[PDB]
Design a protein around this nucleic acid. Sequence first.
RNA 1: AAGGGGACCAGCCUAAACCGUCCGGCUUGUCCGGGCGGGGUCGGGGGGCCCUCGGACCGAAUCCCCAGCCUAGCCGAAG
Length: 74
Amino acid sequence: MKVILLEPLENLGDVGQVVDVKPGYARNYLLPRGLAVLATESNLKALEARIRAQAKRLAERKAEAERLKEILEN
RNA sequence: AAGGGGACCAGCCUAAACCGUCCGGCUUGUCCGGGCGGGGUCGGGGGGCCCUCGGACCGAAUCCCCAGCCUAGCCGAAG
């Protein structure tokens, strides 16, 4: 089924990406070896929490920047 | 079996959303989930979260106290 990959993974995807596999792969390879995690509501969120948080931390980074763009070059 | 006639008669608590707290996980975070707490219980669909308005009567299957009752008994007419 669906999993959230914790690492980069050959022909599946980049970390954090959500890909769809056969459950045998997931349960006997991916999950045990901390390579991916099941795509449950409960960590489908932790995907987006990490996302939102990432977006905002960059937002301030382009904020206190825009300060240092008008206050500088001036 | 529905139905009709009867017996008895009684209706409730949660899960979830939302809020709070404590605890532990690592990826700190508007995170995730574990407990406890609040909130909620319905088929005129009900509940949550917001806006306005409103403004003591119920009531236990729980806890008391009592009557009554069971576990000995007693009085009891007239040759």
